[PDB]
DNA sequence: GCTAC
DNA sequence: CGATGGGTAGC
DNA sequence: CATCG
């Protein structure tokens, strides 16, 4: 079984402090998809790059510890593609890519445009130029899986309050839209919705209030799969045993 | 303190 | 609905 | 952005 998991760690260094290390060979996962590493090269330790023997490959925001995605897999890819090769973005590192037969994987860590409305602007124009892209990687022909933090909840069962966050950003109707867009139109499958109809899942919890004792979340972390590999999904979970970020692993396990 | 989620 | 208060990570 | 008026 490919068991692949997908988590926004908040903080590499901060969730290595709080066991996520060994999280990583505890859940026996053959791929680990991280977002938010919040840190630098220089930053990391050999077992933030390379964990439990596994091969790893990074992408690193030109900011210190801010952003930053990575891949980890037992098996060594062939190929590894740093950045989507718009340095407007890739000065964030936010895009990482892994080739493994007919197989690839993404670690992507979209941004959020909640701390400010340029913030948002960046958000989407992240949007216009990444949709091509997933254009492209569906068109590829190959199975494709982009896990990680996409900052977008789709609809009113990805979070708990939607009739409030309808104005926020994470659940703006342009966004959405195009998630949808993203879903039906490109032909990628939200993994998650589809094994589970009506379960909401949850990935996310705000910091305010008791959000993560109520449970009051959103679903903001995805994994995109294209529709031959989307098929041989057996199950998945939402990890909440232990909390290593504000975010939650997102585990799929496939028949692959 | 700061930044940024 | 609109108005009100925010914990964390790492610089 | 959850919680309050
Ligand atoms: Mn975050």
């Given at each position: 079984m490919l068991?692949?998991?997908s988590?926004?760690?908040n903080?590499?260094?901060s969730?290595?402090?709080?066991?996520?290390?060994?999280?990583?060979?505890?859940?026996?996962?053959?791929?680990v998809?991280?977002?938010?590493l919040?840190?630098?090269?220089?930053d990391?330790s050999?077992?933030?790059?390379?964990?439990?023997?596994?091969?790893?490959?990074?992408?690193?925001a030109?900011?210190?510890?801010?952003?930053?995605?990575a891949?980890?897999?037992?098996?060594?890819?062939?190929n590894?593609?740093?950045g989507?090769?718009?340095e407007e973005?890739?000065?964030?590192?936010?895009f990482?890519?892994?080739?493994?037969?007919?197989?690839s994987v993404?670690?992507?860590?979209?941004?959020?445009?909640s701390?400010?409305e340029?913030r948002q602007?960046?958000?989407?124009r992240?949007?216009?130029?990444?949709y091509?892209?997933l254009?492209?990687?569906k068109?590829?022909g190959?199975?494709?899986?982009?896990?990680?933090?996409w900052?977008?909840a789709?609809?009113?069962?990805?979070?708990?309050?939607?009739?409030?966050?309808?104005?926020?950003?994470g659940?703006?109707?342009?966004?959405?839209?195009?998630?949808?867009?993203?879903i039906?139109?490109?032909?990628?499958?939200?993994?998650?919705?589809?094994?589970?109809?009506?379960?909401?899942?949850?990935?996310?919890?705000?910091?305010?209030?008791?959000?993560?004792?109520?449970?009051?979340?959103?679903?903001?972390?995805?994994?995109?799969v294209?529709?031959?590999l989307?098929?041989?999904a057996?199950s998945?979970?939402?990890?909440?045993?232990?909390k290593?970020?504000?975010?939650?692993?997102?585990?799929?396990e496939?028949?692959?």
């Amino acid at each position: 079984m490919l068991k692949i998991i997908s988590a926004n760690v908040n903080g590499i260094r901060s969730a290595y402090k709080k066991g996520f290390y060994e999280y990583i060979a505890a859940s026996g996962a053959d791929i680990v998809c991280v977002q938010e590493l919040k840190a630098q090269e220089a930053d990391l330790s050999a077992d933030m790059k390379n964990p439990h023997g596994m091969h790893g490959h990074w992408h690193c925001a030109e900011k210190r510890g801010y952003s930053g995605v990575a891949v980890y897999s037992k098996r060594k890819p062939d190929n590894v593609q740093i950045g989507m090769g718009i340095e407007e973005f890739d000065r964030e590192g936010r895009f990482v890519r892994c080739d493994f037969g007919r197989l690839s994987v993404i670690s992507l860590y979209l941004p959020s445009g909640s701390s400010a409305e340029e913030r948002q602007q960046v958000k989407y124009r992240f949007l216009d130029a990444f949709y091509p892209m997933l254009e492209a990687m569906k068109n590829e022909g190959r199975d494709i899986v982009v896990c990680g933090d996409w900052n977008i909840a789709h609809q009113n069962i990805d979070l708990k309050n939607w009739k409030g966050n309808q104005k926020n950003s994470g659940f703006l109707p342009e966004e959405r839209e195009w998630i949808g867009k993203v879903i039906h139109k490109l032909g990628w499958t939200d993994m998650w919705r589809t094994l589970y109809p009506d379960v909401p899942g949850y990935t996310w919890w705000s910091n305010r209030g008791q959000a993560y004792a109520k449970d009051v979340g959103w679903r903001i972390d995805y994994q995109m799969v294209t529709p031959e590999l989307a098929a041989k999904a057996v199950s998945a979970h939402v990890y909440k045993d232990e909390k290593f970020s504000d975010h939650a692993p997102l585990v799929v396990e496939y028949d692959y």
